[PDB]
């Protein structure tokens, strides 16, 4: 008989492991690896050669953050794997320790961001096909699986196959318009500004103002401040004024534990309540290359799709990923989008001569019960169908053509 396919959604800040056919990932670990690192001289490809069996003395996931004598490395940066040695070791413990899957009896469904270079896919195919020897692989785009995770929380008869998926993870934020089940790939947008940029901005804010934060935790604090006291503001300068004139109400206190002497430190959370998420509607706060808000990027995405599929795309904007769990994020997004759309419609009516008043475009932003792991569940659907075993790259295909079998994805033509 057949065994369920393994689903491994490898994200920059968190990896979701499971067996296809379930409702939620069996494991959600941090995407980090603790290896023994010491003071050495020479290149990186030369000091990584470990004598004996010392290359198996490493940990991953939750067990890699606890280890205080190991060095913690993150192999994935901005969704693109920058280190393949650490990624191979991470994958081998993901398969042989957590999933406990024999990699020769299970099809694998990995994930990727839209702008993953083809050489990354070729290296992933080389790893899964020659090292782990999987009978089949399928590298699906991350946000396109997040659409089929909003159907579990919406009433019957309004579970559509058309919508704009906004996936904001730890390292990348991408916008994918799906229409009737077909990924409109030539309209996908991809911005490397995401949760971790918010965490760097927040720690730089805290470090310029607060005192008493242990250095070795200056990041771990900026996550607990970001994922707890952060919201979205309707206006920036008005919020600065609201904090200045009535600071006794808007300024909160965060009390953490210094995990060396177990003492407690206390800091004041002020402007970084609303300046964190604001790098979504002002990306220049974290990366001066991008200057375009997320509402305008979504509007460009939808306005580039075919005409008669623009009106349903506005109706089912599905959020996904952790970085979209900010209070009143969807509300401000929908407000800006409604402003843009109504202004465009009124301009078109005025240019027409003033005879017809067209239907106001319904704009809706869908928050659902599965956002934190909306991608994985989507995979758990796709990798549970029969047709799945018809779209995978069989081992024969790799043995015949080579890793170049995995070189194409729906973002580029030919």
């Amino acid at each position: 008989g057949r065994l369920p396919a393994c689903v491994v959604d490898c994200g920059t800040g968190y990896t979701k492991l499971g067996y296809a056919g379930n409702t939620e990932p069996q494991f959600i670990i941090p995407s980090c690896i603790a290896i023994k690192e010491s003071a050495k001289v020479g290149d990186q490809a030369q000091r990584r050669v470990m004598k004996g069996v010392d290359d198996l003395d490493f940990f991953i996931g939750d067990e890699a953050i606890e280890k205080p004598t190991y060095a913690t490395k993150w192999p994935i940066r901005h969704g693109i794997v920058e280190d393949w040695d650490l990624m191979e070791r991470f994958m081998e413990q993901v398969i042989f320790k957590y999933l406990r899957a024999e990699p020769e009896d299970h099809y694998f469904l990995l994930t990727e961001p839209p702008l993953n270079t083809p050489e990354n896919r070729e290296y992933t195919a080389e790893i899964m096909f020659e090292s782990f020897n999987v009978p089949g692989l399928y590298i699906a785009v991350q946000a396109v699986l997040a659409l089929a995770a909003s159907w579990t929380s919406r009433q019957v008869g309004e579970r559509t196959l058309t919508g704009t998926v906004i996936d904001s993870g730890d390292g990348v934020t991408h916008v994918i318009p799906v229409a009737e089940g077909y990924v409109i790939g030539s309209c996908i947008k991809h911005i490397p500004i995401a949760g971790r940029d918010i965490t760097y901005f927040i720690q730089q804010l805290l470090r310029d103002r607060e005192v008493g934060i242990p250095p070795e935790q200056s990041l771990e604090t900026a996550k607990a401040v970001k994922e707890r006291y952060s919201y979205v503001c309707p206006d920036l300068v008005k919020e600065f004024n609201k904090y200045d004139t009535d600071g006794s109400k808007w300024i909160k206190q965060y009390t953490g534990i210094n995990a060396i002497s177990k003492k407690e430190f206390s800091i004041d959370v002020g402007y970084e309540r609303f300046l964190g998420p604001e790098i979504f509607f002002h990306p220049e706060f974290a990366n001066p290359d991008f200057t375009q808000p997320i509402s305008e990027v979504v509007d460009e995405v939808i306005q580039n799709c075919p005409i008669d599929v623009r009106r349903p795309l506005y109706k089912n904007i599905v959020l996904s990923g952790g970085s979209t769990m900010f209070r009143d994020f969807g509300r401000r997004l929908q407000r800006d989008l409604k402003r843009t759309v109504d202004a465009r419609l009124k301009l078109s009516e005025e240019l027409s001569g003033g005879r017809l008043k067209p239907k106001p475009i319904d704009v809706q932003v869908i928050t659902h019960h599965m956002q934190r792991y909306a991608v994985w569940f989507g995979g758990s659907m796709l990798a549970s169908t029969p047709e799945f075993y018809q779209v995978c790259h069989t081992k024969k295909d790799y043995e015949e053509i080579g890793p170049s079998i995995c070189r194409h994805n729906p973002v580029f033509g030919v």
Binding site: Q26, A45, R89, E102, D105, E130
Partner: protein, 300 residues
Amino acid sequence: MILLEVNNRIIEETLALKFENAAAGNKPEAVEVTFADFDGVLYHISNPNGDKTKVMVSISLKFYKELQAHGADELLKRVYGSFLVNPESGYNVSLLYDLENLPASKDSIVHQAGMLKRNCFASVFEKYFQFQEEGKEGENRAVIHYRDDETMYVESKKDRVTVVFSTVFKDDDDVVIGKVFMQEFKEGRRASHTAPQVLFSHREPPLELKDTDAAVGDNIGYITFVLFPRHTNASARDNTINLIHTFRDYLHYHIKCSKAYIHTRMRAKTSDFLKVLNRARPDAEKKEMKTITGKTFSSR
């Protein structure tokens, strides 16, 4: 991780979560989690007939028939008590935890629930340990089909227990590296003054497999462990069972880590060859000093 572990993580995690939700007094939610393990084992944790108060953990194995033989459930019964119930349709063993009658110290039953496969294996294996302890020669010797193309022939004598693994790997690269990993397996007895006699053979099957249906062929390797009464006593048989159980999976695991090991040496040698090529690029006369980003220096 060098040695594979015997306890499954998903079972322990799910059952501990359910027991924390039940002990705090929250209302129980549904659960339906199906997954797999090594050697083609299939687990299913669900509820019996939508009854959200009972959790049934079922397991389907490959040694289907050897566990149904009389006396192959002594260990399972002894360890699981009243949790052992009739198998769920399609599966082979099944435990049933009532979330309202859970005894105190919920850590022990979860630690023994994560080792369901190890316990099903040790139950069909301690039969011969006992056949040898009780001082009886010629006791029953069988072939556990612990996989689908590989076998484990167990035999119990008056003074020893012989375990013959008939093993074969699926992939060609894995076969070629496994020939080495199995040839070099007798060089391990130099690491300990007390290790079971290990014999390797791939020219011809041993004389134990001439009356039995253990898998034989010209692509199969035979690894014979001779466990003596210092490895099968009532105090060191747990470790022996764990090792004999996870031997094949451990060999497969390390065969698949050997490649990720070799890749580092290959990268090192690639860089060493690039350094020999670099002697061909004529050194520039003057370089423009840049910044960490790569922009012009903007100053002297």
